[PDB]
Amino acid sequence: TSKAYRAAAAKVDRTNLYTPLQAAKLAKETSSTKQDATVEVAIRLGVDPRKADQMVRGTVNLPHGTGKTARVAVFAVGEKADAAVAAGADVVGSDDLIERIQGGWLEFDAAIATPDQMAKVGRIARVLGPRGLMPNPKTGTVTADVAKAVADIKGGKINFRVDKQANLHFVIGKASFDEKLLAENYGAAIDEVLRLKPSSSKGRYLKKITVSTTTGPGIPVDPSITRNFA
Amino acid sequence: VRPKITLACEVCKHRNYITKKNRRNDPDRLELKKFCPNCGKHQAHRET
RNA sequence: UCGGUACGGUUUGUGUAGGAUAGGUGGGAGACUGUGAAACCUCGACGCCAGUUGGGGCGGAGUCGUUGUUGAAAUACCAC
RNA sequence: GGAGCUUGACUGCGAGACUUACAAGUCAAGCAGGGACGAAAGUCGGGAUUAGUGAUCCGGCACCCCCGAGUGGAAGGGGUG
RNA sequence: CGCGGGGUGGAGCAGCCUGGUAGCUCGUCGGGCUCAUAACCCGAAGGUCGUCGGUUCAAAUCCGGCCCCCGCAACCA
Ligand SMILES: [Mg+2]
Ligand SMILES: [Mg+2]
Ligand SMILES: [Mg+2]
Ligand SMILES: [Mg+2]
Ligand SMILES: [Mg+2]
Ligand SMILES: [Mg+2]
Ligand SMILES: [Mg+2]
Ligand SMILES: [Mg+2]
Ligand SMILES: [Mg+2]
Ligand SMILES: [Mg+2]
Ligand SMILES: [Zn+2]
Numbered sequence: 001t002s003k004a005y006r007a008a009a010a011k012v013d014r015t016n017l018y019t020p021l022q023a024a025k026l027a028k029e030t031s032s033t034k035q036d037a038t039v040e041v042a043i044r045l046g047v048d049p050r051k052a053d054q055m056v057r058g059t060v061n062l063p064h065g066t067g068k069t070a071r072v073a074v075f076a077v078g079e080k081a082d083a084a085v086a087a088g089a090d091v092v093g094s095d096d097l098i099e100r101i102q103g104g105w106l107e108f109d110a111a112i113a114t115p116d117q118m119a120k121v122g123r124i125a126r127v128l129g130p131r132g133l134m135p136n137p138k139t140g141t142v143t144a145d146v147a148k149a150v151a152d153i154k155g156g157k158i159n160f161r162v163d164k165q166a167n168l169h170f171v172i173g174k175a176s177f178d179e180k181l182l183a184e185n186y187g188a189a190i191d192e193v194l195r196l197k198p199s200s201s202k203g204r205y206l207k208k209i210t211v212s213t214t215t216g217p218g219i220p221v222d223p224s225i226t227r228n229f230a
Numbered sequence: 231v232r233p234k235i236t237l238a239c240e241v242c243k244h245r246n247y248i249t250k251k252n253r254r255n256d257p258d259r260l261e262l263k264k265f266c267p268n269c270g271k272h273q274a275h276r277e278t
Numbered sequence: 279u280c281g282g283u284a285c286g287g288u289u290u291g292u293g294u295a296g297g298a299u300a301g302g303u304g305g306g307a308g309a310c311u312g313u314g315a316a317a318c319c320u321c322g323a324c325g326c327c328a329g330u331u332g333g334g335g336c337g338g339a340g341u342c343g344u345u346g347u348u349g350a351a352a353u354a355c356c357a358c
Numbered sequence: 359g360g361a362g363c364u365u366g367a368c369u370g371c372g373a374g375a376c377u378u379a380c381a382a383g384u385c386a387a388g389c390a391g392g393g394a395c396g397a398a399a400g401u402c403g404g405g406a407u408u409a410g411u412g413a414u415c416c417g418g419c420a421c422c423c424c425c426g427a428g429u430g431g432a433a434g435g436g437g438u439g
Numbered sequence: 440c441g442c443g444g445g446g447u448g449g450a451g452c453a454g455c456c457u458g459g460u461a462g463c464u465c466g467u468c469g470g471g472c473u474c475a476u477a478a479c480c481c482g483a484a485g486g487u488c489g490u491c492g493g494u495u496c497a498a499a500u501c502c503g504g505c506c507c508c509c510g511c512a513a514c515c516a
Contacts, residue, residue, distance in 0.1 A: 003313035005356090014286085034356095038305060042358040050502055052493065130344080130351065161303085164495095167358060169304035212357035214305055219357095236420090245420055245439075249367065257506085263393080265368050268421090271392055272368090278420095 008033045008216050017222035020229050023211040024182035026219055031175035034215035038067065039175050039182065042218070043168035043193060044208035047201050054200055056162040059140070059152075060192045062185045066156030067174030071108040073097060075121040075135065076146050080114050083147035088154060095120060102127050109133065110153045112141040160193070168193065175213065186211075187229030194226065235259075237275040239266045245278065 008030055018026070027039050047054040073091040074084040075098070085092035091108060093100065095117075101108075102124050111128070113121045113135040125134035135142050139159060140149060160170050172185040190206070197205050206226075212218035231254065237247040247264055259277035266273045 001313050002309075002355095004309085006313080035308065037308095037356090040304065040357055042304080044358075048502095050494080052502065055494090163303040163358095165302065165358090167303060169358065171305075208358090210357065214356045215309075216356075238420090243421090246369085247367090248439085262365055262367095264365075265392060267369050267392095269392095270369095272365095272394095 004034065005216070012217060012219055014220060017220050020183045020186055020221065020225060021179065023219050023221050024177075024179040024186065027175055027182065027211060027213065028179055030213055030216035034213060036175050037214045039172050040212045040214060041168075041170040041172060041186070041189075042210050042212065043170060043190075043206065045162060045166045045168060045201075046203040046205045046207050047162070047166055047198065049162050049164060049166055051200070054198050056168065056193070056196050056198075057160065058192060058196050059157045059159045060189045062156045062158065062173055063188060064177055064181050064185050065173055066158050066171060067176070068156060069109060070154045070156075072110050072112070072150045072153055073101060073108040074146070074150060075111050075113040075117060075124075077114065077117055080146050084112075084150055087147055087150050089150045098124060106133070110139070110141055110150070111135045112143075112146045112149050112153075114146055115142060115144070118142065183229045190226060235277050237262065237264060238278050239264075239269065240274040240276065242266060242268045242273075244268050247275065 011029070012026055024039070031037070031039075045056065047056060049055050071091070072084075072089045073093075074081050074089045075093075076084065077094055081092050081094060091097070098120055106127055111121065111124070111133055118135060121135055128134050132139075137143070140152065140157070143149060156173065158171055160168050162168050170189070172182055172189060177185075190209075193206070206223045209221045209223050210218040211221055231252065232250050233253055234248055235251055236245045237249065237260070238245045244266065246266055249260075251260055260275075262275050263272050264275045265271070266275075
């Protein structure tokens with residue numbers, strides 16, 4: 001079924017591995033084919049994530065943005081909030097800002113709080129429960145640099161984390177970008193995964209990689225190319 | 231019950247010394263300051 | 279005739295709480311009907327409460343998660 | 359006999375002796391490096407002392423980076439523990 | 440030294456690959472019936488699932504370190 005999906009499936013080949021340029025060249029021809037969404041990257045690694053020291057986790061600075069609003073409320077006191085309104089955070093307050101969100105307009109994305117204020121801000125998670133806007137050290141939002149970590153959210157620091165079955169599922173941004181501008185994202189993101197190779201990674205490290213949307217099919221990519229994205 | 235254990239430096243990892251402990255009275259690895267001839271000074275030494 | 283291996287399609291998954299949305303991860307409100315929607319029939323598939331159903335037979339345009347759980351939360355839908 | 363802190367149960371050496379068919383065995387002042395204890399003098403190269411052990415060959419592991427069968431490497435070898 | 444499994448109630452053994460309950464057998468206790476708990480019958484005690492840590496909301500199960508047995512193939516100058 002799905003007559004709009006077979007039309008893209010009668011286009012991309014299975015028995016060929018494409019270049020990173022051709023991968024975004026059909027991602028634009030899938031986001032023209034389908035209704036537009038995020039370009040997904042599924043990396044299949046040669047690690048075993050059941051041993052502890054082969055676990056892969058990290059982030060990436062995409063130089064063309066991940067296509068995200070990044071509305072930030074900053075729960076801090078003193079200059080720590082004042083360094084965030086100068087950073088470019090639109091909703092900046094104090095213990096007052098505890099009150100302005102739990103009653104209404106809980107419309108932001110991250111809450112980077114100081115470790116001294118984690119008690120009173122932690123009750124806002126009772127309305128920020130299913131959306132994960134609570135201050136979290138696991139997302140880089142509880143630290144001593146509560147100011148310029150908002151700028152990490154603005155530019156598109158996408159955190160990755162390998163699953164139980166050695167797969168990195170991963171994004172490069174919205175599909176409204178240029179084809180050569182997606183390979184700038186896609187090039188400077190694989191190399192970030194190449195940074196986090198453990199020494200005990202037996203075998204071939206980046207075995208299989210594919211490029212898909214959340215609406216169209218996947219694209220077979222050649223893992224041989226790690227430098228020549230330009 | 232009294233095995234021959236070797237002591238390695240905690241910096242350069244050279245196996246400078248060999249000795250004996252009791253496997254039952256001291257069931258974990260020894261820690262002693264010993265002279266490391268590579269570093270030219272006293273370093274810490276665990277087992278291997 | 280019974281396998282092994284490389285690869286594709288199909289399908290599988292039921293502590294309690296609770297959508298009956300019932301494997302992990304990702305993001306996912308538009309994929310969703312001539313690719314002829316829903317009702318209705320029942321050649322079947324399995325079994326642990328309601329079949330999740332690969333039945334391909336009947337239709338004449340939804341087979342929506344923000345509510346109200348499985349960490350809990352989607353699991354319509356797509357890559358893996 | 360009791361107590362406090364410690365790792366000298368050191369590395370580079372060693373004038374001069376004991377014992378002795380030979381191979382072996384044993385003792386050693388003092389010098390330097392880096393240390394422990396002590397206010398200092400000093401003392402410490404396992405244990406009051408003498409038993410608790412096994413030549414060579416052949417290999418194993420760790421380090422040094424000496425040789426490397428035309429050359430560059432590697433294999434293999436060599437030294438030290 | 441490599442590999443190739445195993446430890447779970449007093450003894451024996453599943454569950455482990457694939458994550459949500461600790462069970463079965465024998466022994467014991469108590470009760471019943473009986474010449475005889477020989478048998479048969481019912482109830483219960485007996486467990487950090489070898490110990491440390493680690494990963495997950497949650498581990499007997501999965502990872503790693505440790506003790507502890509059992510095999511095999513060497514090494515054995
Ligand atoms: Mg002791
Ligand atoms: Mg000694
Ligand atoms: Mg001499
Ligand atoms: Mg001195
Ligand atoms: Mg002093
Ligand atoms: Mg002396
Ligand atoms: Mg000989
Ligand atoms: Mg040569
Ligand atoms: Mg060599
Ligand atoms: Mg020498
Ligand atoms: Zn050293």
